[PDB]
Symmetry: C3
Subunit: 309 residues, 3 copies
């Protein structure tokens, strides 16, 4: 009975190794998904509350949006020549800056004036590096993410709005309610291992990943999404700043421009999926390989038992 027991044990182990790793259930990874993101929540920046229309830069609500948390405004920028207001651009001789100095505000002319050598262009350049406050109440904003995915190979359409496992006081917590699509901005920042104060002050590119890992052999309700968070702006000047320009020409001839530098927390929504469904061909391939492996194991077992090595 030793040979039968040993071959049964070998076959059982081979089956465990195969079906545990899903040798069958051909896998599809080309998930086609659509994301609709909507921000809700109000906050104050200077002396005035700002609704959703203000801070979020892309109003459509695409896969990628920006939550603006700090604004630096430079108004009435006129064309001309003038020195730069930054420290690092010190000029002691007229030959210091030429076709070797990286421009910071405009095209250089090869001169030197007192405030720094003359960049040409928008004269009142950004006086940056100040103690401007941040939209602290943005720590309490909420993001509603409606994600609709469709695995094409198996024709499997699904969405994250699962009605079983209200939407007015629920948040997203991976422990209590890991299924509500409403993500608190403070919660997203905290779950990424980041302090919110520094992230809002300097800016960063967070990322929300919706892993659609499902086993289609089970029921339709079993396919559930998993939310994860990360930061994708780590080097090893870190930050995320971007500028809008609004132009106007007053009737007295001069051409003006106001420049708004925004430090925000850009959110990226990345959808990844991996769905495995049972298919005849991989099942046959795996069964044949398992049979041959069991045969090889049986051929080796008697030899190793007889030789005790």
């Amino acid at each position: 009975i030793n040979r039968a027991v040993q071959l049964l044990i070998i076959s059982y182990f081979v089956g465990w190794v195969f079906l545990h790793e899903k040798a069958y259930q051909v896998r599809d990874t080309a998930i086609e998904s659509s994301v609709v993101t909507k921000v809700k929540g109000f906050g104050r920046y200077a002396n005035r509350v700002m609704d959703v229309s203000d801070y979020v830069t892309p109003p459509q609500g695409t896969s990628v949006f920006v939550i603006i948390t700090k604004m630096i405004v430079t108004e009435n920028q006129m064309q001309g020549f003038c020195p730069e207001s930054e420290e690092k651009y010190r000029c002691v001789s007229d030959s210091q800056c030429g076709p070797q100095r990286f421009p910071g505000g405009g095209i250089l002319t090869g001169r030197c004036v007192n405030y720094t050598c003359e960049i040409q262009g928008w004269c009142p350049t950004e006086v940056d590096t100040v103690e401007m406050p941040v939209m602290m109440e943005a720590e309490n904003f909420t993001i509603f993410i409606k994600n609709s995915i469709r695995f094409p190979l198996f024709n499997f359409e699904k969405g994250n709005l699962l009605p079983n496992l209200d939407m007015k006081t629920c948040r997203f917590h991976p422990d209590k309610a890991p299924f509500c699509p409403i993500l608190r901005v403070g919660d997203v920042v905290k779950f990424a291992g980041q302090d919110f104060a520094k992230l809002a002050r300097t800016g960063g590119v967070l990322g929300i990943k919706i892993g659609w890992v499902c086993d289609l052999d089970r029921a339709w309700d079993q396919c559930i999404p998993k939310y994860s968070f990360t930061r994708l702006d780590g080097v090893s000047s870190p930050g995320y700043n971007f500028r809008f320009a609004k132009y106007y020409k007053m009737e007295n001839g001069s051409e003006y421009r106001t420049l708004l530098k925004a430090f925000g927390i850009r959110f990226d929504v990345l959808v990844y999926g991996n769905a495995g469904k049972f298919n005849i061909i991989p099942t046959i391939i795996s069964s044949v390989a398992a049979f041959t492996s069991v045969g090889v194991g049986t051929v080796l077992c008697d030899i190793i038992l007889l030789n005790f090595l």
Copy 2:
């Protein structure tokens, strides 16, 4: 001759099962694609026709754009305190709204006035829910979609602009001309199983999918794209509304803001591909599995015939 005929039949069935499901022809699903969308067509909204530059929100023509169909304008919004114009925010006592009421227009102060308790912020809030007309002529807009895909594993570059199977009066109909890239907006809405009037009045997020399913073992001209349409904004307040803010500061000191609420039909272009090419390794694997399966079938056939069970 019975055994030879039976083994030939078993081998033929195994070959049918294998080659029908493409046991060989290793498959690649990581399709790298680029989409350029351009809208053409004019329509009237208030008392004036609007060209392409007006209704479409992203002027670049990215993978996702919005066809604005309804506009609600609130001009000269000033900062301050005032009640809200919506019905649902009824206030009979000063304690009704506090740290339990969801803000609708601004940060609450805990008071109660006649128009509703005081939200702080942009005072002339949106008087919404009106009978504003819709851009009905947007039913006749056309969308030109240039899609260029490149399967990287096989180095296979292709595009949907097939010159064989003019581009001035052709539309997209899956029956007559299922190859023209020009998609009528009314046609897209109709093919999604949606009435255009309600969709334009309330807004929605349609989706155009370009399935690049091809068999590279055939000629280059055989690889063709298939267009499909769906809606990806179905819960089970449905809609798709987004707001622009334009700011101006008149010389008499006050800070103003005009808010434009747009109800549009956002179009998402999703590209999915699955290309299978013959490879030596999967062919050998499939042949070995087929040989072993045929052997197993022959081993079972004589037994089942002799035992008649």
Copy 3:
């Protein structure tokens, strides 16, 4: 010794064929990536230098941005009826244009006036096709691309900012330094097999592909990205033009609009990945198939040697 030598040679060839094509090392192609693009560099267009805030259309720095190189401005567009300024719309009789003529500037009315029959809408239409100069200094712009990828199946996070194989004078050249993420716009245009003058004058949609092809069986530092460039706006009127509209209502009642037509070079960043990691199941499958193929080869070899055919 002939049979042993022949079977060893057959086994060696089978192993070469299998391990060379990676029969083992299950492959994942669903790469989840995030791209942050930042443009640096100044240029002059009319009589004034323009910094980053001006030419690039999406200020956020998404996966797709546009480098504007030519601007055509039409100011003070008023609603009304007037003929069109283009040549192709010749009208000799009042019945020439009707429900058969493609509108170019507005909704037609079925009349004929001297400048061309009356389109309704923004009256001072674009007088296009001029000799407007181009932002030639945009040939010296630089693009910083920070790409962070994460293969989910193997949980493999990586980025293109490799610190071993400064970032102030380095460019991207596939021969000298093929690893610096700083891409010169002129270099990108040249590597796509395109002249920069015509591309800037008419517009085009270039594409930068970051192939993340790695072998995870080696060390972590071995996984490196490969940059490639292409053009995805080739038919077989080519170009890429898009228009912004800025509205204002002067106090004397009339409603105005200024239209800015931009000819740019839109850059698309496409991330593709294919990562193979050793797994037990594919290894067993490949070993079984190799054993069976070697057996078949041995069965055929003696026959072909004895029969000499």
